[PDB]
C-alpha cells in the first residue's frame, strides 16, 4: 500500500480518504477544504502586474466592442490541443498562463464542427479563408454540419426557415460539457491515462462476448480519443515549459493545472457553452495550504485568482452574424459555481469564494467568468450581504437554488453549464439542444399550420379556426395537438444532431475528464412561455377577434376587455404558463432519444426571444410582430407591475420538477427600491431571494435569478456615450454582456425590459 | 408513365419488362439477350490500334516485374473520384477510356484506409510522401486503420504476431463489394440519382418515429454519399467528354459507361479485390443491335470489347511489402462471370462469352481481368470446348460451379466476387475476413497455448497434452476447444475492424449502384485446412510421438507407419477435413456480429498458405517448420498421387453447405495427361469438369477449379529466362498471376506443388 511518491509529496497534509485510491475529486474535497464563516475584511487588492496585464487587455477589448468583431483571428490553421504555439499578454508579469491561440484574444479555427460558418465568419469579417483548410474540411474530413444536412428532413428545413426551430446546434458546437478539470491538478496527467486505461481494458469483455456491440465498440474508440487527448494536454502544457504528469505541489499549480485542463477544451472545441465548472472551494484547499505554511501571502493569493479569472476574461471564439443574433453580447459562459451548501450541513463557502467575488473590484466589472452564487438560506450572512453588495456594485452575478438542487440531486459537488443546467461534474453531461417557438406553435393551431408569415404549409396541414372570436377550449385543443408534432420535430432535430456530433465532432479532451459512464439528458427549450401564456388568458378572460386576410389566415387580433398578465401573482394567467411548462414535457418525454438521452425541458432563450420574436407576427396577447418576446422565463416587457415580491412569485411557480434543465429569470430592480443606503440595501436584496428561493415540501421555490441594480436613465446614457461605460456589465437572460458589446437592436430589447421600481 | 423521350430513343427495339419502370438489370437481360450455342469461327482479330496500345502497355508490365515494384505513384495528391485529370495511353487509338490517374499504371494514393500503409510503400519504393497529406490524415482525418487499432484488443494484437490471426482488412481497404456498374449503362446517372433520393425520403417516416433510431440515421447517411458520389460520376465522365447522365445509346457506350462506373470504385477505394462482376452478357445486349443495325462490325466490337478488357489489365494500387506476400504477384481480381444458365433453362452464353475470352488470343495472356466461367453440364457442348481449349493455350482461365449456386441462390444474376465468394449483383456484399490459421490451432492445443515459435502465451492458458504418444480424441477434444476461442476472436476482429470501414472508409460509389438495404455476410477464411486434416490423420492411424523441449513444448513429430493423406478419395481422411469445416463454421455461427452480418465460411488463403505456413513450426503430419500450407482448400504440395480424379473427388467432397463464402482448389496438369492431341485433351478436361462440377440431390459436387495445363520444367525454364515469357499466366490460389511477377520464394512454392501425371 506504498503511494507513489510523486503523489504523496504533493498531498503532504491532506487528510486521507478514497479520493487517494481512485478518482474522487469531490471526497479530497469533502476531507480538506475549510469552511469560511467571515466576511470581506481579509481582501487584498490587485497588484502592479495584475492592473498592468489587464489594462493593456482591456484595449484589445475596446476595440471588440467598438468594431463589433475579432481583434483579429486564423486563416490558414486548423486549431486543436497542440495547434498553437504558447501566447502571452506579457510573460514577466503573469503568474497563470495560457491562450487559445498565440495572440491575446486572437480568435481560431475549430474546423471540426463545419467549414461553411468559417467561411460566413471569413467574409463577414473581412478575412480570407486559405484555401487548403477549406478543401480538406469539404472533401477529406466530413463536418458536424455536412453531417447533419445530410440526413435533416425538408420538414425540419421549413421549421427552421419559418422561425418554429431555429438556432439548433447544427452551426457550432454544442457545448453543455463541463470536463473536471479540477482533475488535472488532484491527480495529474499521468495518473489519469492509467485511469482510462482501466475503463478501455473494462470493456473487452462485453466487446468479445458481443453484449451491446455496437455500443461497447463506440465507447472502446471515444476512451482510446479521451485517452490520446490527456497526453496532448501535457504536450499543450509542455509549450508553456510546464510538466503536468505528476500532481499539482502547490497553489498556483493547482490553479495552473485546472486551467491547462479547460485550455485543452477551449483550444478544440467551440461549443456554445464551455464553463469552468465548481472550482473555487477545490482551489481553496491549495491556497490555505500555501498560506499557513507562509509560503504564499494574501495578496499573491489574489494575484493569482485574477490571473486565472483574467484568463477566463479572455477566451473567445470566432462566430457568424447569424450566431452574433441568436446569442448576443459575445458570449463564454465560463460558468463558476460558487458557495453553496454540504449535504453534511457546513457550507462549501471558503475564502477563496470572496477571493473570486473580489475580482470583480481588482479589475472592474466583467461578464465573464459567469459567476454563480449557489445560494441556499443556510449560507453565512456575512457571504449572504457581501454577495449583494457586489450585485448592488456590479450587476455581474447570478443567483441559484441550492437549497432546491443539492437536495434533488442529493450531491454537493454539481455545477451549473451555461446559464441554468445543472450536472454532477464529471458523471453527467447534456445534449443541447437550444429552444423551440412555443408562441408561432399556438398562431400555426390558429392558421392550419400554415406560416403567417410566409403563407406556406410548415405544420401539418388541417383546417383553420372558422370562428369570429376565439374560444379557450376550441384553440387548445388545437395547441395541443401542434404541441405534439412541435416535440416530435424538435426531438428528431435534435437525434441527428447528437448522432453527427458524436461522430464529428466528440469533444475527446473534456470527457476525458469524465467517468467512464456519462449520465446524458436532451435538453429541450421553449422560447416565449409568456407570449404563449398571456395569449391564451387573452382568451379565456376577455374578447379576441381575429384579422383575417383573402385566405382566412390570421394575421392580427382585437382586443377588448382587461385580462390576466403572467408577472403579477395573479394564479388565472401564472397557472395556464405552469400548465404549459408540464404539457410539452410531457410531450417530448414519451419519444425516443439518441443514445437513450433522459429528456428534460428548460425556459430559456438567450437572444432567441429577440430572433424569434422578430419571425412571430402578432399574437393573441397583444404583442405586435416582430417584438421581442421576454428573456428566459421572463413576462413580457413591462407586464409585471405589481413590484418585486409580485414578479418573483410567479415565475417561482413555474415547475423545476418539468424543467430539470433550468429556468432563466432576467431580474433588474432600481437603486431606490432596495433601500435608501447600501446596508438597507443589501439586508433587503438577501431577504428578496431567501423568500424568492425558499424551498419547503409543499413550496418548490425559484430555480434561478440575474440581478440588475440600476437606473433606466443610465443605461439611456451609455447608449448616447460608450467611451464613458468601458467594462460595464448587464445579466441578460442567465448571463452577462458588456453594455457596448451590443447591437443597437439588441440594446433596444434591453432598455425596453421590465425595471422594478418597487416591492 | 416511366418512359422519357430520351430514354426511347436510347433503349429503341429493347422488349419491355418491369425493368423500364424501377431499377432491375436482371429483367432487361432476361427480356433482351440473344442465346448463343454455336462455335468460335465468327471471332475476328486484335485491329491495328488495339496492338500498337497493348505493346505500348507492356513495355510498363515488363518494368513492373523486373523492378517488383510501381512504375510511378502519387505522392502529394489524395485520390477520389474527381481528383484526376483525363489520362491517355493514346487518345487517338482508344475506343474505350478511362485511368485511375493521368498515366497509364501510375498507382495513387487512397489515404482514407490509413497512412502508414503509404508511408511504409513510400520507404519501400523510394519516394517521399508529402507532409501536408501526412499531417491532414493523421490529425484531420482519421483514417480505418487508426480506427481499429484504438479498439483492438491486445489479445488480438498477439494472435497478428504469432501467426493464429493475420491478415485481415485493418491495414488496406477490405473489398468484397460489386457495385452493379451495368445500371449506369442501363439508366444513366441522373435516373440512378432520383432513385436513391426516393431511397432516401423512404426512410424518414422511421427516423421520425424513433424505429432503429441509430440504424436509420447511419443509413440515411449513406445514402446521401452514394447520391454525392454518381453526381462525382457524372463530373469524372465529363473530364473525358463524356456526358453519362442519360442511358447508353449504343454498344461503345454500354461498354463506356459501364465501366466509368467502375472507373469511380478503383478511383476511390483500394479494396483487395474489386471485381467487375456478371457483364459479358449484359453488354452482349447492345452489341447485338448494333451488329443487326449495320452500325458496328464483328471486328470493332471485339476492338471495344479488347479496349474494355485492357483497362482492366491496367488496374493497380499502390501496396506495402506486408501485402505483397499475403498478396502476391499484383492481384486485383477485376472478376469477370462469364456464361451460367438461365433459372428458365436458356443459356446465359453469347457472342460476347466468346469475345471475352478472345481477349487472351487478341492481346495474350493475363492475369486479369479474373474471367470465371459459370460452368454448367447443360452448357452448349461448343462453349464447353473452347473454353478448355483457351485453359490449354493460357492457363488464364478459372471455373465455378453454376449448376450448384443457382440453385442455392436461387438467381440467374449473381456474381464471384475476388476468388469464389459468389453474390447477387447490387442486393449483396461480404464483409471480407481473410483467414485464420487452423494448423497453429492445432499446435496450441497440443501446447497449451504457446505459440511453438515465439514461446510465449498466445491462446487460453491451459494444460498441454501429456504421454510420449499422440492421441486422436484427446488431441480432437483439445482443439474443438481451442477453436472456440478461435473462433471469438476472429469475430471480434472483423467486428472491430468492419465497423471502423463503415465508418471512415464507406464504398459510397460502390454502394450507390446497389439496392437501398443489401445483404450482408461475415466471410470467414480456413487456412491450413489439409495441413491440420492430414494431421489428425496421423494421429488417428499412426504413431505420432511428440519431440517436446526442456520446458515441455512441442516443437517437432516422430511418425511410425503410413497414415491417409487428403486428396487420395480416401474417406478415413477427407472425412476428417469435411468434419473440420463443419466445426469451425457451426461455432463462428453461434457468435454476434457488427450489422448482423451472416457469419459464412470459405477455404480460401491467396498467399497466406506462404505466410502462415512461414509462422508455423514443424506440424504432425509431417510438414517441416516454415514450409508452405497448400493453396486454398488443396491437398499438401505432392501429397495427391492418385490422379486428377482422384484429388477432384476429394476436394468436391467438401461441403459448400458449411462454407458460403467458397472452397478454392488450384489444379495443374500436364499435356499429356489430357490426351495426344488438343481434340482429345479439349473433350477429357471437359468431361473431368463435368464430373467434377457434377450436381445432384445426394452429391453436392465441387465448387471452384483453376485450371493449369503446363509441364513443371517450363516454369524452371522460366525461372531461369524470364525474358522469354512476359505474359505467361497461371492459377495460383483462386485468381491468376504473371509467373514473373512473382518473389523467388513464391515461386518456389508453385513448382513444388502437385503437378497432376495422370487421371
Ligand atoms: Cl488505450
Ligand atoms: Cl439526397
Ligand atoms: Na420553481
Ligand atoms: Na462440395
Redesign the interface.
Known sequence: SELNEKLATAWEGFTKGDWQNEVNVRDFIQKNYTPYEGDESFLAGATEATTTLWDKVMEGVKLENRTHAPVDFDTAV?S?ITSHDAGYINKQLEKIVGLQTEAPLKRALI?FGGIKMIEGSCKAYNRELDP?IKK??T???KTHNQ?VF??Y?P?ILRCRKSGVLTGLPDAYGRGRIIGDYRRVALYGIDYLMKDKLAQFTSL?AD??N?VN??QT?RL??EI??QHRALGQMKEMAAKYGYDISGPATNAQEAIQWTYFGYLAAVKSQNGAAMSFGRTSTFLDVYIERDLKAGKITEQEAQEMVDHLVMKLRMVRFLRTPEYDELFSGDPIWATESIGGMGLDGRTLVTKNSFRFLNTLYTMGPSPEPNMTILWSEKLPLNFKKFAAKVSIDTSSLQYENDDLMRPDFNNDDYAIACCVSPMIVGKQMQFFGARANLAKTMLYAINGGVDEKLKMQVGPKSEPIKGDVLNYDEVMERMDHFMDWLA??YI?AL??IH?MHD?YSYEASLMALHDRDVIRTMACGIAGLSVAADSLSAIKYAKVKPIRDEDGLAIDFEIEGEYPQFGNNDPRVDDLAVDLVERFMKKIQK????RDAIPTQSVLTITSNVVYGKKTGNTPDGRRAGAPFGPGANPMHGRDQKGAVASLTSVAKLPFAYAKDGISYTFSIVPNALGKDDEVRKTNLAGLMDGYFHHEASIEGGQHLNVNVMNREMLLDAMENPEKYPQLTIRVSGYAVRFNSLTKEQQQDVITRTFTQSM
Open positions: 486548423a486543436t474546423p487548403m480538406i474540411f472533401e477529406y474530413r453531417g445530410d440526413v428532413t420538414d473487452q466487446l468479445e458481443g456491440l455496437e465498440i472502446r474508440e482510446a480519443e416530435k420535430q428528431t437525434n441527428i448522432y461522430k419519444l425516443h432519444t439518441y
